[PDB]
Point group: C2
């Protein structure tokens, strides 16, 4: 029955719905208030230096004061995680599986994850006996056919390296 | 069994993991490639004026070209959705259940969703008998105790107004 959070295998709700303390999605005090696991919690979940380096779920911004939300108070000056308005440098893996572009910036989409992607959720990174025994970054699995990724297709049968099985 | 997407009741994967065409979370082409439902798809899902107004899952930014991603190419100049670097005004709902603050800006966290929140995922907007018959915004449900929200706690038993079941 559970939809989200610890009870639902770490799933997130869609469209910023709060995951209640019991593992169901919705809005209002029962979901977003005390015990809120993810989504648009009110107040925002603690993050960053104020929570042992935890990032915000759902790609929220971590404010200077270590709360998760959106808007200039969260993503602007002093933003310490998520989609901050400042460019995010990398070389230092990107947080939350963001791609480190050829040019050393974090993001998602082909400009970041496509050709020249260094790390994170790259589109097509080669590994294993297909790529000279090359290793995957981010502790991803090398798949049977020599692509880096995660999930059963890469970590399951024929997995060459990384956290197989 | 299913984790995400249509098969997983619309749930999102954590940490920008891609939801495969079969409703499982991971990275690499099997998950992020053709049929990718959410997460860090590559290429990014179509969005905005290139997808009938649809917004990016997981609060990704919609680029001016109508692709979902993060970084300056997506969130910066020309961004048409998600956590764009530009402030977003409201008064005119906010997209993706973002709160419209009393000052008419979209975001999440207490500065937006707390005192004076006009619409979206407000922390504690009163409604129903307890608020002299006041209505909820966003087609939310008014719960039995007179708070606006969504999910079984508000739309279920005791629901006063909005799309009760």
């Amino acid at each position: 029955a559970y939809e989200c959070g610890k009870q639902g295998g770490g799933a997130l709700c869609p469209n910023n719905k709060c995951c209640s303390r019991y593992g169901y999605c919705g809005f209002g005090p029962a979901y977003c208030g005390t015990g809120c696991q993810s989504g648009g919690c009110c107040p925002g979940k603690r993050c960053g230096d104020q929570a042992n380096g935890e990032t915000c779920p759902n790609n929220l911004c971590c404010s200077e004061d270590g709360y998760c939300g959106f808007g200039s108070e969260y993503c602007g000056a002093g933003c310490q995680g998520g989609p901050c308005r400042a460019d995010k440098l990398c070389g230092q893996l990107c947080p939350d599986n963001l791609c480190c572009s050829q040019w050393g910036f974090c993001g998602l989409g082909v400009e970041f994850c496509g050709d020249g992607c260094q790390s994170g959720a790259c589109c097509s990174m080669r590994c294993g006996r297909q790529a000279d025994g090359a290793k995957c970054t981010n502790n991803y699995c090398c798949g049977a056919s020599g692509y880096c990724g995660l999930g059963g297709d890469y970590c399951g049968a024929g997995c060459q390296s990384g956290p197989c099985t």
